[PDB]
Design a protein around this ligand. Structure first.
Ligand code: FGF
Length: 299
């Protein structure tokens, strides 16, 4: 690999720490960076490091190198996992990105579901869950903002889900893994992830049936993400096996309106799930529509 002085960071200024998980595109590892700001050489900062496994092919290297160059080109936005630096010299390939200490949005929501009535009343709010409606709207808005930026940078996140949206310490939404070479030509539509996810339930019809991805494919996926948000991490198409998902999509079946969800947002969901991709809202339109809702419920 060639030296890029613009993004190059001394590997000795990185202290790797407890792994965050591993997948087809390598492993993600939490780490501390010293002097990520060149103005303050000794200041510590908390980052995340993308790397390869011990069992990696030269294809896996090319894939990670690919993701590196993608992040170099897309630039900074508050609502995406930004590239901070890289380590390409005299050691293993480290791609240093931002950290999101609160984990992915799905787990974030599932951990903060309101207490069931089986718990005894203790305190003036003992029935008041961590998550309120305006905050849930804000999460949706932040994801839409970032996706609109990614679209303007001509980037198609072909898997957009609550699982791939990370939450910072300050409860800021950040889109992750938007530059992966996801290998769309060989998707096992039936295989379930180790945590039980069936990624096919986020795929737009033209992507699932015709292998076609556009920015409107992500708008569809964003519509599913909206469903995830207002079910507080619920699994889409509940109880429906992949085989039944196939025929239901061909009939044009859509998810019902989830409980405790206003018609304004289920409306946006159904707009994102329109058959013709040209009749789904753009990400710019989603931002504006979600903004009006957010402004309405905030005094
Ligand atoms: C940041 O590295 C970080 N991220 C996560 C956790 C902890 C930390 C760092 N950290 C903060 C303070 N605590 C007390 C100590 C500490 O180590 C733990 C929760 C989960 N984090 C996380 O998911 N970070 C994360 C993950 C990423 N990958 C997403 C896919 O997971 C494989 C990415 C990226 N990209 C960025 N951050």
């Amino acid at each position: 690999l060639p030296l890029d002085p613009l993004w190059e960071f001394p590997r000795d200024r990185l202290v790797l720490g407890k792994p965050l998980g591993e997948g087809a595109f390598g492993q993600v590892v939490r780490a501390e960076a010293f002097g990520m700001d060149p103005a303050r050489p000794d200041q510590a900062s908390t980052v995340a490091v993308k790397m390869l496994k011990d069992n990696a092919s030269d294809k896996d290297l090319a894939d990670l190198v690919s993701e590196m160059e993608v992040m170099k080109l897309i630039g900074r936005h508050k609502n995406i996992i930004n590239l901070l630096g890289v380590c390409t010299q005299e050691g293993p390939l480290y791609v240093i990105v931002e950290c999101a200490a609160k984990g992915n949005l799905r787990e974030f929501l599932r951990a903060r579901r309101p207490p069931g009535p089986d718990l005894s009343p203790d305190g003036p709010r003992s029935s008041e869950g961590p998550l309120s409606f305006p905050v849930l709207v804000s999460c949706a808005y932040q994801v839409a903002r970032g996706m609109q930026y990614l679209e303007s940078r001509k980037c198609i996140h072909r898997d957009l889900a609550a699982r791939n949206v990370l939450v910072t310490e300050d409860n800021v939404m950040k889109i992750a893994d938007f530059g992966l070479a996801r290998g769309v030509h060989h998707i096992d539509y039936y295989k379930k992830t180790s945590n039980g996810r069936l990624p096919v339930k986020w795929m737009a019809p033209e992507a699932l049936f015709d292998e076609v991805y556009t920015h409107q494919s992500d708008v569809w996926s964003f519509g599913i993400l909206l469903w995830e948000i207002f079910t507080l991490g619920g699994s889409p198409y509940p109880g429906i096996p992949v085989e039944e998902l196939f025929s239901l999509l061909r009939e044009g079946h859509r998810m019902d309106r989830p409980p405790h969800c206003p018609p304004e947002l289920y409306g946006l969901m159904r707009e994102c799930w329109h058959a013709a991709p040209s009749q789904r809202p753009t990400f710019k339109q989603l931002v504006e529509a979600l903004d009006k809702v957010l402004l309405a419920v905030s005094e």
